[PDB]
Amino acid sequence: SKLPLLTENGGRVNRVGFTRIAREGSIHKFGFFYEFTQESIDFDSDDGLM
């Protein structure tokens, strides 16, 4: 049924159109830490604990 058709001199018969779409992304942040004391590292029985 929907087949484009024209004659020898053709004007204003079949029109088309176009469309575009968009996407997204985002960023987050993370972290953690730990704490110690000097007496712990100095008087520990194990060297190289750090």
Next chain:
Amino acid sequence: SKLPLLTENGGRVNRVGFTRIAREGSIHKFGFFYEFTQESIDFDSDDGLM
């Protein structure tokens, strides 16, 4: 029953004929178009849409 059998003295006994047929085909025309404006081409965010 329908074998072509000849005889010692025979003429005008077994005639045959032939036939031919014809085929045909035709061509058609297709086409379509699209339109735009100067405002769309100039003020569109993305260049090279065309």
